[PDB]
Amino acid sequence: VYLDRKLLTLEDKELGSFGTVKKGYYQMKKVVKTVAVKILKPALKDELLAEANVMQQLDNPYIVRMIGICEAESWMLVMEMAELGPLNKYLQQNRHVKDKNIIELVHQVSMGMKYLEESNFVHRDLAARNVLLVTQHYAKISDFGLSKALRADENYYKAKWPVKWYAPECINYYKFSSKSDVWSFGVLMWEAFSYGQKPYRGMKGSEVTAMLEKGERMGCPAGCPREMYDLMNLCWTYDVENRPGFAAVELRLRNYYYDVVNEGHH
Numbered sequence: 642v643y644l645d646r647k648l649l650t651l652e653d654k655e656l657g658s659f660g661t662v663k664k665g666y667y668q669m670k671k672v673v674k675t676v677a678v679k680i681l682k683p684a685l686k687d688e689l690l691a692e693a694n695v696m697q698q699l700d701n702p703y704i705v706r707m708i709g710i711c712e713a714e715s716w717m718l719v720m721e722m723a724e725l726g727p728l729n730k731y732l733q734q735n736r737h738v739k740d741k742n743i744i745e746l747v748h749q750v751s752m753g754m755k756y757l758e759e760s761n762f763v764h765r766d767l768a769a770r771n772v773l774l775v776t777q778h779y780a781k782i783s784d785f786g787l788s789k790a791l792r793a794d795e796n797y798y799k800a801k802w803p804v805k806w807y808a809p810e811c812i813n814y815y816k817f818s819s820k821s822d823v824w825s826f827g828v829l830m831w832e833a834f835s836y837g838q839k840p841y842r843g844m845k846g847s848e849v850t851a852m853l854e855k856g857e858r859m860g861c862p863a864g865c866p867r868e869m870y871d872l873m874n875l876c877w878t879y880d881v882e883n884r885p886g887f888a889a890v891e892l893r894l895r896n897y898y899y900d901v902v903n904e905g906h907h
């Protein structure tokens with residue numbers, strides 16, 4: 642888990658700006674591995690350790706792999722690089738990405754979330770900005786800074802918040818479950834099919850709450866298939882008990898994805 646600083650080489654330029662994100666390379670047994678490095682500016686240190694503790698436990702093709710942590714100039718979290726970056730920024734700059742391709746990527750996120758649910762972790766920050774692209778056809782989930790391992794005896798974690806991605810039970814009762822992540826996943830779907838547009842544009846958190854409480858939901862994105870909008874709305878089931886889990890969500894996406902693939906060949 643504790644990486645050797647002399648095996649780590651950071652690039653001069655910054656990828657983004659907790660602190661900074663930098664591209665680097667970590668010298669392995671034989672090969673060199675391209676990495677993304679989260680570099681911190683007591684609370685921030687503990688947050689990074691807890692984050693690393695979560696990632697260390699996760700083993701799945703659709704989740705970003707942590708290489709390890711390094712303590713030098715600053716505290717550093719070293720991850721397998723996902724070269725194409727955040728999904729929302731990518732779709733913003735690539736507006737001709739095909740509908741089938743969007744379905745493929747969100748289905749991959751649901752597979753990752755299915756695993757996370759089975760592992761009894763709640764993500765708590767599941768948004769398009771936190772999906773990273775390895776390729777145009779390969780997405781992984783990242784940013785486990787708010788993530789929690791659920792207690793053996795409870796199906797929820799009791800708590801700035803990303804309010805526009807949060808389910809009503811999160812807002813009203815501070816309770817976060819895998820079902821709460823399903824709600825965020827609906828918002829993520831909406832973002833993806835809207836090519837990385839922000840959800841609830843021009844609205845305050847309080848107005849979002851008021852809107853949802855009135856039974857209103859965001860409209861169907863341009864060119865988004867009815868079946869995928871139907872799934873979004875199902876993810877936005879107000880009552881947690883009646884909201885689907887990720888096993889059901891992933892199945893719906895898997896089946897629909899296979900249908901569209903058959904349409905393409907035909």
Ligand SMILES: C[C@H]1CCCN1c1cccc(Nc2cc(-c3ccccc3)nn3ccnc23)n1
Nearest residue numbers: 656657662677679720721722723724725726727
């Ligand atoms: C840095 C972001 C934002 C602007 C563009 N930019 C780009 C661009 C290309 C690739 C990446 N990759 C990665 C970024 C972050 C990360 C970590 C912390 C915060 C944000 C992102 N984590 N990570 C783990 C694996 N791969 C990445 N980011």
